[PDB]
Design an enzyme around this catalytic site. Sequence first.
Site, short mmCIF file in Angstrom:
data_model
loop_
_atom_site.label_atom_id
_atom_site.label_comp_id
_atom_site.label_asym_id
_atom_site.label_seq_id
_atom_site.Cartn_x
_atom_site.Cartn_y
_atom_site.Cartn_z
CB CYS A 172 48.91 17.85 31.51
SG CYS A 172 47.91 16.38 31.91
CB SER A 173 46.16 20.62 34.61
OG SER A 173 45.68 21.22 35.81
N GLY A 214 47.02 15.29 34.81
CA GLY A 214 47.96 14.19 34.64
C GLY A 214 47.38 12.98 33.92
N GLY A 237 45.20 13.61 30.56
CA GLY A 237 44.75 13.96 29.22
C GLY A 237 45.88 14.21 28.23
#
Lengths: 294, 292
Positions: free
Chosen positions: B223-224, B226, B228
């Site tokens: 994700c952003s 890594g 959540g």
Amino acid sequence: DSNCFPFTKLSVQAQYERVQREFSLLLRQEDPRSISFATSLKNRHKNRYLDILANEATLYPQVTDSTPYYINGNLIDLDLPHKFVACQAPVVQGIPDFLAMLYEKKISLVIMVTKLEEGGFVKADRYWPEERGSGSIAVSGNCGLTISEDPGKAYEVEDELKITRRYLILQRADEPPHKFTQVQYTGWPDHGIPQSATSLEALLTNVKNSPTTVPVVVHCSAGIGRTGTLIGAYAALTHLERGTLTDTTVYDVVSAMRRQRFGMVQRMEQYFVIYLTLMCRLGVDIKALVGLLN
Amino acid sequence: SNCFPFTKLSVQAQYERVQREFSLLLRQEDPRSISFATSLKNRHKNRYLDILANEATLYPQVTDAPGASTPYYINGNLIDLDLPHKFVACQAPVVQGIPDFLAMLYEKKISLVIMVTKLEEGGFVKADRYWPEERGSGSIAVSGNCGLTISEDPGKAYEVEDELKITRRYLILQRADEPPHKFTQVQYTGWPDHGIPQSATSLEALLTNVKNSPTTVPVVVHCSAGIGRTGTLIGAYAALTHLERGTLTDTTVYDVVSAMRRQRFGMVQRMEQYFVIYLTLMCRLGVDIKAL
């Protein structure tokens, strides 16, 4: 007149001996078994030092209140125009908490009285963008904050004072930005004394010119040593300025700080520095005393 | 075989339970006792000041065979859950670490990359593009001295599923005259940061991609940061794979997330994301949601 400060009447030896005697008496009063450190104790993952804990009664920001973040820090109130937050340098995993605190509490001034590393040991962890960078860094924790260099106000480096001033902007998405100033003083290493009296005075000038509506955040590594001296000197000098300096002011001020954050003013020479700042303000030569401490 | 008594509890029973399991999970890992040595050394390649990859499971280093080493860095960790698929949970790479990330994909012959973030969300950069965006042609040289190139597969154009907010990119990594390596990247843009998917179907589609992907290499998920949305997707995968094989126990959701946090610090960041795993497991068991 009105100020009474007979410390300057004592010989150099008597001055040195009185400081040592008072500092030992302060340590002599330590009794942490009776004090609650509940919140600080369950957050050891975010404590830089296992046995340097924040008192529950004055834990910040919890005493201004669910606060969903933890800083190992306490509200210091000495009945003066400014209150302070004395706290540790946040560890990496505690930085989002620290920044969130700055943001939610609208803190206007952060004073850091240590280098990141001294003598081969880590004292603190960077929480500001590096000059050589894009100008912004972010934390992912606590639903995310970004901290940036103020585009209209560059970092200031004062080489003689060993002070760096960083003008910063904290932002969360879809919320208004918050500007604050961080001032780092790197000319006073742990276990030593300030390289020059002028730097501490410059720091206190920042404190005075900052707003009284929010506490000033002050940290070193554990947030009780150089942090305690700075806050103590501020207090002691305020008494001087309003004509209420007495022969017991330094002891009394440190005693009251200690009730609000256990262990404030950690080392003998740090307690000594408060007397030295008073002497310098008074125009009394401190060279022989500085000589004895070196 | 499926024992999941979570369905046979009250509305404020369940909610109370998840709250306490997650609060337990929040305190499991002691960062004071964890090495993050390489991640700390590679601070300039980290997207977030507070997000560091564990040394013990750092990928691809954890695969290197004694004395052999790795000349690049990703903020990512191998996640093993004793299931047919393994995962590399990693951040969206920063510009300075894009070459490392692409080198990792090529050298480890990664077949599938799942991206669960937009490039930007509400004015804030969450990720950096590492795929060509041309009129289908698209072949760009990657920075570094390697000789790595990335191209859009001329034989299979990008696919845009506007209904599920999913884009499928078929890409090729090529270095020198070595045999080129094909992979698929799937990006889901309907899942805001620190939050939950807008579509259960969209999530199920990503898992189908995962299941249909080869088991001989790990699946890369970022994700952003890594941890959540990445953690939630991997957790959901695991729990569902258990619900399938019939191994779903009462403590399966807790145990997979506990296992994930062991291997990459902080996996599944917000309690709501922990709920998604319970939710998209009850909602697969046809049991009605609450929701909040």
